[PDB]
Amino acid sequence: GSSGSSGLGTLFFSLEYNFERKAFVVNIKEARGLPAMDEQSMTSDPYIKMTILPEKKHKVKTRVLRKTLDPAFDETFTFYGIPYTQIQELALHFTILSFDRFSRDDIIGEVLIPLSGIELSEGKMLMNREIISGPSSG
Incomplete structure (x- = not known):
């Protein structure tokens, strides 16, 4: 059991659709207020995972920063095939994990x-x- 643990910063991002080429673009800004995981210099290498739900097909993740409770990936992924009208049936699943070797x-x-x-x-x-x-x- 346990009781007491603050953290879980925020996640910033901006959606975009390549209307020109009728494509989907999911930009992943940066994350602030990330809880440290490594017990070395009070830091970690967190990373937000991108997923197009429900489908969950187009699976992509943002670069894995190095030691920083406030990493900035500001990545962007494009996708073609989306009839746009399906966008209303999509969903960006941002998973705030924490990578640090040793899987x-x-x-x-x-x-x-x-x-x-x-x-x-x-x-x-x-x-x-x-x-x-x-x-x-x-």
Whole structure:
């Protein structure tokens, strides 16, 4: 058992659709307030995992920073085939894990952003999400 543990920073990102080429673009900004994992210099190499839900096909992840509770990947992935109209049936699953050799899977938190309703038509929009202990009563 346990009780007491603050952290789970935030996750910044901006969705974008290559309307020109009718394509999807999921840019992953940076994450602030990342809880340290390594017990060396009070730091870690966290990384946000990208996934196009539900499909979950197009699987991509953002570069794995090196020692930084506030890494900035500001990555971007393109995708073609999306009829756009399906965007409302998509969802970017941002998993805030923590990599540190020895194959370590420490999901700091789980983030989800259902494009179901979102309007990218206008253009690119900035969005943020809070990192908590899974989507369980919150």
